[model samples]
Target chain A: MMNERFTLPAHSPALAALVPEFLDLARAASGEERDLAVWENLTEHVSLDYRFANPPVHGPGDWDTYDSRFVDPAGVEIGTLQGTGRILYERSSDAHLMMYYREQLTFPDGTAQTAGWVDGTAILGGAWQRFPILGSGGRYGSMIGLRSFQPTPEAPHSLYRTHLVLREIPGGHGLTDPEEIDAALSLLGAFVGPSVNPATG
Target chain B: MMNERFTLPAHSPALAALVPEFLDLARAASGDEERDLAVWENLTEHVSLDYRFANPPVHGPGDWDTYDSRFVDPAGVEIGTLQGTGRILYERSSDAHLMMYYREQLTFPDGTAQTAGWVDGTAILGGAWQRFPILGSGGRYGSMIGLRSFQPTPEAPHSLYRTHLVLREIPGGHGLTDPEEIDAALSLLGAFVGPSVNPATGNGRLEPP
Candidate 1:
């Protein structure tokens, strides 16, 4: 090892500021406890146009599995998908079920292909069903984000709309603003889990 | 765009003999349907530390670190090699002992990767060291499920580990699935966790970007 002046500062200012506050907020079974997580405008936003290629394969556990295709808005194919859903709760023909989707998405320029999954609950009667984008890899890779699905009425076939918000990329858009910094840490204290809850090949 | 093949050969005599024992143990753990539908394998390997913070500077749970090792047959012929991509999931002091949770990707020689699964253990200052669960995998190992448990071995001159895996296989894998070949590669497992080819000193430490 080279001789180096490498002793770190006894304390880091960032940690000094953040830890005490996190502790102060966590000390109470009730104090400053965040009932929810908040992640501000961050990461990439994507919209997927897709449709099922065939009817679902129904199986035990009332599971429904489908092979689907991801397309461009103009109806050009760009990806492939497989999805499975099972009822978690039901009544009056209206049920909520957990949904899982894994898809490989190709880019127009052929530079990136993000293969990822989404896990969340869906409402039988509702148009907008949202889930967390578990994670993905390749060019458009991400770990935490949200995806919303809706079925649209097209003349011959129904179309599925999938939108995603990818995880954050490095670089701070905020700097030296005390108020902004406080908001970020306050949100951190309010959480034990991800704002989205979950990525990769 | 490609016609992929995933079948691996059957076990070798040494590996074949060891295979049935693990199969018997694996049967009861999986449900009846799973038992009938698939093949389950239990594997073990020992590895040495390749590097710490292989990515350097940013050692967050999300960033992956690396390791390297070689696989050998019963005759001790070196067969293939691999790299380990490990992510530190959670770090804490548990019961007065330092602990780290991890998920590691085992990349085979042909660029095929398998998530060895998830594992957690105490990082013994005096004692030892330590996935394949999420996101599945690409290349030849796609769709296979992997569960792994790794722990540090006692007081090695360098960091060492004993890794165990319960791997469930599906079709479409290629070159290296022969029972004996598979056993040859990882069953004897030992790896080093460091940068194998850092140029600064022909063995440089991980450098910052």
Candidate 2:
């Protein structure tokens, strides 16, 4: 097993604002940071809207290495989502599962490709599955971080509740310096709204 | 989906005395003389294949992760690599048999052979794993349709897999040069599936761990 500390930036100013805080935290703690030398934890929630793609030959059962032996007499469903993107349950080790989640979401402007691994045991038993995002393309061509969440009452299967941390291209719009946002917003002040502190509502 | 043909050479000329046709076969290949080397189809005449796994993969699945395995043959062993990074077009669930569509690399001291099709991860009659596949091959085994098997003894994923496949890729190839060398090569290939490799029967040495 690899031994290293992955101190999360959960308490950083940017992260408190729910922005990618890895690079900033690393820069603060270690003098500077590299392009791909960052790993942070964060959150997200995707709807279970994607349609299920091609399925296996047999139904849920005593999963065998050669064939589906017996059907799980109760509720049993395998996750294989495909519409905007896909997340497949590759293998089941005892009660835990190994998954490969990827998505290529298309918007009005451009598209973004993201992928990560849902590996390790105790996965389905509510432990946080830290799907470290290591792939991206198109709009999000340059990015990295983690998207994690427990697979339980916390996050519904299809409509998942996930945590995401991302550091995109050096100057990408998503992860911005808080000062920059504060500067830009104040410049458009009155046009946006007045600080009406005359009386409490 | 791919349209190509190629082969390998042999141990030049001096080592014609060397048993492994791999080096000898590469000396005369299917091309200017770059060509498709033949995998002699012979029966395993018995073979300790010392296997080592290194360059461990990362925590999660990355598109192309790599690792290497080294092997020592019975008295006279050699080395090779497996070029194993073909995305599964699809695979079955744990509730069913393990089947996936992908191709794998068979890298010998000479060259590499890419085999693609269905990879079966079916268990034996009493629930042990067995690996066998039918596919199209390229690079070294490029000229022909292939049938290969990696039968590791039921030794509990503790370490390197043992037994047949010592000559692993030479699956069912016709001999060349001399019967002596080919037989030696075939024996190293681990083609035998008899009691010698399986402990399910009497006098069998290998057993489920």
Candidate 3:
């Protein structure tokens, strides 16, 4: 809504010069390719979201089941996560087997990056889980999940990690950085590292 | 402390029958011969504990420097997460890495189990990542990271899941359940399921801090 206000240039030649080149380095890392892949730190009005998951199966060990609406705190689901990609590895039902998967925004050219992953009432890896507290009169909260690339020298694991928050802020507020727009676009590439076969894998 | 008051002889027979059965089943499936585990319902209070993690690291990237402190609301460093067992997977520096490993607990042995990781510092695992928020006070805010569990089973490749809030009545008001207690204890065998592994060498650990 206020994009026009920020349209004007705010940098001064001398001030710009004083700025470190590392900032430029950071911007270049994201590139147009991975620009949208960066996770957006979330901030939103408090509201609750209901979620439900498939009940846990009767077995020796499994998550307990609850056949009811799961209430998340208000503002918990502000839809503010960003990232280049998400790598998910979940165990299947039998518990004897396991699996890995990912969520990425694929391009027509087969070049895919990432957004976020499934939230409440959605299937994560294979089973049903819920985020019930978010949509309704839940607590105020915010969060982000980023896909960190650990490739080549960085490491040998192209893994995706998620970060979330569903709690009350001192006051319902949002984070708006001076470089937020740029930072949002440039986060994925700024920390450029090649993917490595995680030894853990 | 309140254990005494709440420790009634299983008010509901159904509740009573299920609790022990749940405990027995969990112990059998533990796979750990020593049988260190704890399990209980994911109370509403556990969801609200005031807790957080803070560990400085030398790199950039989200949570590359801070461990998962978001899980424990209402819990202000009840105690630093001790390194229970597991190798660091994602690390920002030489000192810290994501932890992934469950060990035998000495507390409450029914051959029973207890979950306690990241005791000294913040722990790295899914239980802390999912719904917990990084704590902040003025300039001392730690960036938030998402927590997920990729418990790969036969049906699903990566069973991504997270627990919701549970409450426990306290004096002034309702106290949120301590997620660390939930993660380390209740979920280990009780009603809740603590974070777990994905079959890949990648065991769950606190996000790199």
Query: What would the per-residue lDDT of candidate 2 be over residues A121-179, giving only the tens digit for each residue?
Result: 34545455432232234444455443344544555443333333334535443334333
The CA lDDT of each predicted structure is 0.31, 0.29, 0.21
Per-residue alpha-carbon lDDT of candidate 3 for residues A127-168, written as tens digits (9 for 90 to 100) = 221111111122222211222211122321221122121222
Ten contiguous residues minimizing lDDT sum, candidate 2 chain B: B1-10
Error of 2 at B197 (Å): 30
TM-score of every model?
0.29, 0.28, 0.21
For candidate 3 chain B, which ten residues in a row score worst on lDDT?
Answer: B136-145
Q: B1-209 in candidate 1: lDDT tens per residue?
A: 11011111222223223222222323433442242122122222435454455357844333344566544334554434445544443232112122232334555443344433223333434443332221124553443433344445565534444443343443333234432243232221101110101111111111111
Give the chain A TM-score for each candidate.
0.39, 0.35, 0.18
Cα DockQ of the candidate 1 complex: 0.02
Which has the greatest lDDT? 1
Q: Candidate 1: deviation at residue A128, Å?
A: 13
lDDT of 1 by residue, A118-154 (tens): 1223222434443332223443332233334555534
List the candidate 2 regions with Cα displacement exceeding 4 Å.
A1-45, A49-99, A105-110, A116-124, A134-139, A151-155, A158-161, A168-201, B1-209
Across B72-181, the per-residue lDDT of candidate 2 in tens digits comes to 45554554555443222223222233333333456666554443333333332233423322222334443322233343444433234442231223434332333233
